A paper describes a structure:
The second and third steps of the histidine biosynthetic pathway (HBP) in plants are catalyzed by a bifunctional enzyme–HISN2. The enzyme dimer is formed by two mutually swapped polypeptide chains, forming a bilobial protein—each domain forms one lobe.
MBS1 contains Zn2+ coordinated by two carboxyl oxygen atoms of Glu220 and one carboxyl oxygen of Glu217. Lastly, Zn2+ bound in the MBS5 is coordinated by thiols of Cys126*, Cys142, and Cys149. A metal cation (MBS4) may play a role in priming His143; in the unliganded MtHISN2 structure, His143 does not bind a water molecule but instead is in the MBS4 coordination sphere.
Numbering used by the authors:
A (entry chain B): 46 to 185, 194 to 265
B (entry chain A): 46 to 188, 195 to 264
The structure:
């Protein structure tokens, strides 16, 4: 036949002809959105390289961004082990959620359950991006704030911690010391990034582009 | 009624009483696995802090790791905008897939369209972890610019110190942010070569940072 049809024949579609499709940020890992896909949606994602879904309510194919202009440009596609779940790994043109939120996932359940009569949405973030968010909040006196207001102290720390990290290899120190000094390097380097208005995602795009 | 019951009433369950549940590594962002959850599965994930699902084929609740011991320890739970999709954000005790793979997502589709008769599974990786994997592959092979650094500690440490100073210069000398991003990428790359020599994973570094807050 052809290769795409042969692969699509191997997907474990449900009894409506659908699989779960998850869009994920190729540079950061943030989950952008989750929908469903039929044969045509997956084939169209592959051929067009734009994340394409099937709407159960509209009984219709749709492409993220067809109205909003915020397309997800797809770098790769992965099936899970039993072939009923698909990741579209790609780079968003702009906020993925129709609400304007950066991703569709900003409703924290654990926060809802704490004893406090007040609600607040917040994007789901993994550890590296949570640190970036905390530093950005401090920028807008904690020790992070102290480092944001004393350039010379910060740069002295960045050079000092880089040297300490090197010394874990030069003096054959335990790998736990290496991980701890790398954490120190990363933290102070990210305070500098905040001062320069650079996002971690932008740094990771640079690394991707160099190894392209 | 209590807070969990009130929350579960606000989930947009499908006509089998299910929502999609996605387990995601809290430290790295890797998607570990995706299944379905009913009311009881979400309530049990919240109360036990272990990722819990409903099996459509077995019509039964199950907790990831109940046999394999590779539990996913849940740090937070998120709903999507229209409340029919759930992220279990958590830390796995070990590989999530029953096959032994670290995650359930190792079947790349674009490979099957190449020209050689060959197949090769590989974990889905985002940019930072893809670079980590490339360096590890260079370390494993025998007789390349990355390979040069893996085989010369003194050149490598020289570069790390040099690059850290370059990054500082972008602030001290008020350079454009494009320069700062480029120098941070230099710092990251060379540091990650040292991590490879020390057998340290990026995930272990990010765990350290999370634990400090
Ligand atoms: Zn399986
Ligand atoms: Zn599956
Ligand atoms: Zn949304
Ligand atoms: Zn020292
Ligand atoms: Zn240190
Ligand atoms: Zn919505
Ligand atoms: Zn949804
Ligand atoms: Zn699996
Ligand atoms: Zn440089």
């Amino acid at each position: 036949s052809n290769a795409v049809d042969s692969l699509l024949d191997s997907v474990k579609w449900d009894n409506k002809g659908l699989a779960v499709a998850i869009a994920q940020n190729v540079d950061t890992g943030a989950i952008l959105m989750q929908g469903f896909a039929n044969r045509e949606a997956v084939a169209t994602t592959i051929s067009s390289r734009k994340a394409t879904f099937y709407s159960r309510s509209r009984s219709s194919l749709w492409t993220k961004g067809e109205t909003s202009n915020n397309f997800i440009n797809v770098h790769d596609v992965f099936l899970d082990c039993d072939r009923d779940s698909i990741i579209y790994l790609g780079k968003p043109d702009g906020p993925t959620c129709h609400t304007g939120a950066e991703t569709c996932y900003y409703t924290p359940v654990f926060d809802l359950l704490k004893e406090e009569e007040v609600e607040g949405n917040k994007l789901a973030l993994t550890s590296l991006y949570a640190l970036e968010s905390t530093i950005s909040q401090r920028k807008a006196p904690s020790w992070t704030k102290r480092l944001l207001l004393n350039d010379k102290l910060l740069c002295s720390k960045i050079r000092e911690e880089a040297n300490e990290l090197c010394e874990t290899l030069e003096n054959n120190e335990d790998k736990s010391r290496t991980a701890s000094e790398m954490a120190d390097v990363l933290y102070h380097a990210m305070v500098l990034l905040a001062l320069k208005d650079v996002k971690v995602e932008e740094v990771l795009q640079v690394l991707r582009q160099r190894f392209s």
